[PDB]
């Protein structure tokens, strides 16, 4: 789920910011052709632009820091899986644990770190 | 000829008929034996066609029944149950037929006839698409014919009777069906992109024995079996053009450019190699040795079906058929034909006409090196003025424009005419009012036409222009108002008459010491004479002058020629102003410098909110999250400067603006104070008012001081001035905006102290 | 600068219907890859909407448990387009891998 | 040295040429009485319809369009091409489809032209289209007492990019 959020608000804020590179571009020719009506008008659409991505920024940010936690967990999960058995019979869980979450069969993972 | 396809025995089919696929057979549907093909056509629209051609002709076409319900993928193969004589099959939407088409010999070309017999039909309960034949399983000497339906299903006929049927997993737009005998497999193309073989006996026990995503749905599947080396299955997408193995891999793919319409892979040369025939959308056919063009040709039509036989003692001949009806068997042509003009000495070039119409032209050419009525009228009442306009030859595409001046705004500006005939009228009316606080430079106001005259040389029609000037009224922008005694500044016109009652001159403005005030609070006096004959005009604004100094020239003028007399002049002896003229030149330069220092820090102000913008976009696309640095904050000081730096240029426009129109004003007083000092003519009046009024409007490229200081340093270069040394010091001309205004107010006291020597002006 | 001395088209700032993209639910369309297919092309050569495409073919890729090239080609497409070059390469890179076509070659290329 | 080479090419026509020169001289001079005629026609068909730029009476125009976005800045450069000799009465007319483009001053007066200076005069076109349509626009130089323009220009107005 938060990899899907992820992406969607990667998404938008990319679309975003193709907006405020042609706002820039086209306030730029405004300038240029001293048209100061339509530059005050593509810098007021670039501030309205710039608040919706720093409100989106926060947004994915949280969640980035949020998915960075889990994965975390996940991994120090597998460690503690693992830690609890000395020798080689450590090394395969791990292993296993990796090759339980590429195919996310979640019962099974949690037989290998239940069993072994 | 070289790349074209060459003609052979070739026919258009019917009347706007429609084919498709499966239409185009190509085998002995008599059972002749003796290797020659038979061309067998069938449309949707009912007919069957049997043609055996010959290198048109009458009796090529063997036949021409027409069946009731449509043809969908005539067929032939052994389809009877007994013998093993070739049969034609016939697929309706909702029909299948097996016929059979005996031919028997009269004693005379046109003497033999052909009997299609039905050998058996079937109902159709689905609505067919397409087929396929082939032996299924392993049996030989039968071809079991395998339908498929338009919403997926595919039954399957063992040569006799409704053998079974089985939906296919998952199709909703049915595609291109065939069925390998190397593999025993139906092979299809899903909608899904999905290209999938079943093997055969899987589907007789109703599952995929085997699937590859392709990058798109194809049009057509071919697979072909005259090698028994490596066997191989032809899928030619609507994008691409791929060669299977026959595990289900690509063995190799073919990127096309262009839109394919039907493929063939034909007989094969090489060892392992097929080669292979393509229908481009762009009427071309490719050939191709599995993925290199070996050779291309020019098609008529857009080929649909394609396929490649021996007719009447050719081997490898290709017929085509379009969708339209077009037909045509064909050859390669590999001739390659020199590039060269054609000789042809009957077809001479007409010299006397030719030089006719080139004596013409020429004549037009060395002679030009060597239609409407305007009328406007102005009410004596926010004036209503009313503006009439006559043809004589009919004119097309009229647009009447109204300029007035800056300040004076009209209700209604572009006025569009399309034809009219020979003499006929138009008018036209709208309002013109002040909208504003300083008063124009002059109340003059122009309309210009602009039409087209339709001509056998043009029929769009050559543009012509044509103008005429109305002359607004005082009671537009003046009022009358208290005079004052004393004001900052005053000049004097003495006239060689009597001093006339201002009631007499301006009798709108209810003594003989009148005074007005403009829209806008400004104030003027004008004093006629007791003792002297001149008349004084005074105010603190130079400006102010004009208006009321052109008004009082203009009446006077009319005034002596409504009592007859000839001689009067508005001499003004004295000294011309040349120093409160000069201070409003410089309040507009220093605006123009005021705006060009906002507009390079406003550049300045730009450049940063970009870089703050791209560091913050840099921020934005990375993952990683990470503070904001108060980038933000930055950005928002420079949004802010940024505004604050375009209302300063806004408001800094405005005031450029109102400084020259009063500029403007006044130079209309100095000339006209210039054409009086001295005798000038109209002449002599009109190169000044071209020099020093050149613009209505300052622009970042061309302003006033720039323009009125060449065109007075080219007018003191060619006509007032005699040494060369000053001509190239200090009378020279650029059009760029100078640091300081010296160098014009020099060159204006100096045309103003060579004009008093005596000199003239002229262009030459 | 003339408009067109950089391009062989002159430049721009940024490079009833039948369907109202607004209304359909892509959760439910890309369970079924046969509409699948044909509706994220619609979407993104007729309508060129690449934000509904991408939300569209991430949940046909999902649905498809990450197997199908063409998927991850379009999602490539659709980065491609939005800016996210590396994004992009990531999964024409991992179309390559599943199978090579000349059409993953130039989309890398 | 850097002399070029000549393959079989060149020779087959040069052959070509020695064995069939008449011919080739006959068609050349047709074509080439052909292209007189039709260069006559299409500068007769010009100096009717007055559209060079370029054209005693010496002038010389050319309009830049400048900008994307629904306000384009239309500067035309304008040139006296004389030894010593201004012009005094011309000016200049702008011919827009009012539909598609809102000219203010489609109609004003030029400055005294000075021989050897190039006057940029610019204006302010705008889009008034909600779609992208590209639509011509004619410029003529004319004078104050004549009604035929002494001469015109063209300009493609690009599309638009509005909102």
């Known amino acids: 789920e938060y990899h899907s959020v992820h992406q969607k608000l990667s998404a938008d804020m990319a679309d975003n910011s193709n907006l405020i590179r042609s706002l820039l571009v086209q306030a730029e020719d405004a300038r240029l052709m001293r048209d100061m009506k339509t530059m005050k008008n593509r810098y007021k659409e670039l501030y309205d632009l710039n608040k919706d991505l720093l409100n989106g920024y926060k947004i994915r940010c949280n969640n980035h820091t949020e998915l960075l936690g889990s994965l975390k967990a996940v991994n120090q999960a597998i460690q503690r899986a693992g830690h609890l058995r000395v020798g080689k019979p450590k090394n395969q869980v791990i292993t296993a644990c990796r090759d339980a979450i590429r195919s996310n069969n979640i019962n099974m993972l949690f037989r290998i770190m239940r069993v072994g | ?764 | 600068t003339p408009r067109t001395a950089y391009t062989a088209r002159p430049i721009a700032s940024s490079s009833g219907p039948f369907i109202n993209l607004s209304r359909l639910n892509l959760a439910k369309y890309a369970q079924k890859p046969k509409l699948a297919k044909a509706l994220f092309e619609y979407i993104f050569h007729h309508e060129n909407d690449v934000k509904t495409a991408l939300d569209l073919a991430a949940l046909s890729t999902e649905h498809s448990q990450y197997k199908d090239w063409w998927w991850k080609v379009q999602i490539g497409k659709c980065y491609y387009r939005l800016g996210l070059y590396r994004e992009a390469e990531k999964q024409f890179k991992s179309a390559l891998k599943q199978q090579e076509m000349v059409d993953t070659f130039l989309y890398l290329a | ?163």
């Not at chain 2, 149950?81 to 309706?92: D, I, K, Q």
């Not at chain 2, 049927?165 to 005998?181: D, N």
């Not at chain 2, 063995?251 to 450019?257: G, I, V």
Request: aromatic residues 8%; neutral net charge; charged residues 20%.
């Open chain 4, 1 to 163: 040295l850097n002399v070029p080479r000549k393959t079989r090419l060149y020779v087959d026509q040069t052959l070509r040429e020695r064995e069939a020169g008449t011919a080739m001289h006959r068609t050349f001079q047709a074509d080439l009485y052909l292209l007189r005629l039709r260069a006559a026609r299409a500068y007769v068909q010009a100096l009717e319809s007055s559209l060079s730029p370029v054209s005693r009476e010496p002038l010389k125009l050319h309009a830049v369009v400048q900008g994307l976005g629904p306000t384009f800045k239309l500067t035309l450069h304008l040139q006296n091409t004389s030894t010593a000799r201004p012009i005094l009465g011309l000016v200049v007319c702008f011919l827009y489809n009012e539909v598609l483009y809102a000219l203010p001053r489609a109609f004003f007066k030029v400055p005294l032209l000075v021989p050897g200076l190039n006057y940029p005069l610019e204006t302010f076109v705008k889009s008034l289209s909600d779609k992208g349509i590209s639509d011509i626009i004619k410029v003529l130089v004319l004078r104050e007492g004549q009604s035929t323009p002494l001469l015109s220009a063209h300009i493609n107005m690009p599309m638009s990019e509005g909102l």
């Open chain 2, 1 to 764: 000829s070289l790349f074209k396809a060459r003609d052979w025995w070739s026919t258009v089919l019917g009347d706007k008929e429609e084919f498709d696929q499966g239409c185009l057979c190509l085998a002995d549907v008599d059972n002749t034996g003796n290797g020659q093909d038979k061309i067998i056509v069938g449309s949707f629209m009912g007919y069957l066609r049997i043609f055996n051609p010959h290198p048109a002709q009458a009796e090529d076409l063997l036949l021409e029944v027409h069946l009731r319900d449509p043809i969908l993928q005539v067929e032939v193969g052994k389809f009877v149950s007994g013998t093993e004589m070739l049969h034609l099959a016939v697929l309706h939407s909702r029909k299948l037929c097996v016929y059979s088409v005996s031919g028997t010999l009269g004693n005379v070309e046109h003497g033999n006839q052909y009997q299609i017999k039905l050998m058996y039909e079937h109902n159709l309960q689905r609505t067919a698409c397409n087929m396929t034949y082939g032996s299924f399983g392993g049996v030989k000497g039968r071809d079991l014919i395998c339908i498929q339906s338009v919403d997926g299903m595919l039954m399957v006929f063992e040569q006799e009777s409704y053998a079974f049927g089985r939906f296919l997993p998952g199709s909703l737009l049915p595609g291109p069906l065939a069925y390998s005998s190397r593999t025993d497999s139906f092979i299809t193309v899903s909608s899904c992109h999905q290209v999938e073989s079943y093997k055969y006996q899987v589907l007789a026990f109703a599952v995929v024995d085997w699937t590859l995503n392709i990058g798109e749905q194809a049009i057509d599947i071919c697979i072909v079996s005259f090698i028994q080396s490596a066997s191989s299955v032809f899928v030619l997408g609507e994008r691409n053009f791929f060669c299977l193995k026959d595990n289900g891999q690509i063995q190799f793919m073919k990127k096309l450019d262009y839109s394919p319409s039907c493929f063939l892979p034909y007989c094969s040369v090489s060892e392992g190699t097929i080669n292979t025939l393509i229908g481009n959308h762009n009427n071309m056919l490719h050939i191709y040795q599995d993925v290199t063009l070996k050779w291309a040709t020019q098609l008529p039509h857009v080929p649909v079906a394609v396929r490649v036989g021996c007719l009447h003692d050719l081997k490898g001949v290709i017929v085509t058929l379009s969708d339209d009806g077009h037909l045509q068997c064909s050859y390669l042509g590999t001739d390659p034909s020199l590039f060269q003009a054609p000789k042809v000495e009957s077809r001479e070039l007409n010299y006397d006409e030719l030089d006719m119409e080139l004596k013409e032209l020429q004549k037009v050419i060395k002679n030009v090196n060597k239609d409407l009525k305007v009328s406007a009228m102005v009410s004596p009442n926010s004036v209503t003025v009313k503006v009439t306009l006559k043809n004589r030859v009919a004119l097309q595409k009229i647009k009447l424009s109204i300029y007035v001046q800056p300040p004076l705004v009209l209700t209604g500006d572009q006025f569009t005419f399309e034809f009219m005939a020979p003499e006929m009228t138009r008018t036209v009316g709208f309002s013109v009012y002040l909208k504003g606080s300083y008063s124009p430079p002059e109340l003059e106001g122009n309309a210009v036409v602009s039409y087209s005259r339709p001509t056998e040389r043009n029929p769009d029609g050559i543009p012509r222009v044509s103008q005429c000037k109305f002359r607004l009224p005082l009671k537009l922008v003046c009022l009358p108002g208290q005079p004052s005694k004393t004001a900052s500044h005053k000049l004097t016109i003495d006239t060689n008459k009597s001093p006339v009652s201002l009631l007499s001159l301006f009798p709108g403005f209810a003594v003989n010491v009148m005074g007005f005030r403009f829209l806008g609070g400004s104030q003027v006096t004008l004093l006629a004479s007791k003792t002297s004959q001149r008349y004084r005009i005074q105010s603190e604004q130079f400006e102010d002058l004009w208006l009321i100094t052109n008004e009082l020239i203009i009446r006077l003028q009319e005034y002596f020629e409504k009592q007859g007399i000839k001689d009067f002049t508005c001499s003004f002896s004295g000294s011309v102003p040349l120093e409160e003229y000069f201070e409003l030149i410089d309040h507009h330069f220093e605006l123009r410098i005021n705006g060009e220092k906002l507009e390079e820090l406003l550049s300045e102000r730009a450049v940063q909110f970009r870089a703050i913008q791209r560091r913050l976009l840099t921020r934005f696309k990375d993952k990683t999250p990470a503070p904001l640095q108060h980038l933000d904050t930055l950005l928002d000081g420079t949004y802010k400067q940024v505004i604050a730096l375009a209302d300063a240029v806004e408001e800094n426009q405005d005031n450029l603006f109102q400084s020259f129109t009063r500029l403007k004003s006044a130079t209309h007083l100095v000339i006209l104070l210039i054409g009086l000092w001295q005798k000038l003519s109209a002449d002599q009046i009109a190169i000044l008012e071209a020099a020093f009024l050149p613009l209505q409007q300052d622009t970042q490229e061309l302003g006033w001081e720039e323009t009125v200081d060449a065109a007075l340093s080219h007018l003191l270069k060619t006509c007032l001035s005699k040494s060369s040394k000053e001509q190239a010091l200090n009378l020279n001309s650029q059009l760029g905006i100078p640091k300081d205004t010296s160098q014009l107010k020099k060159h204006i006291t100096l045309f103003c102290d060579r004009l008093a020597k005596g000199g003239r002006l002229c262009l030459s």
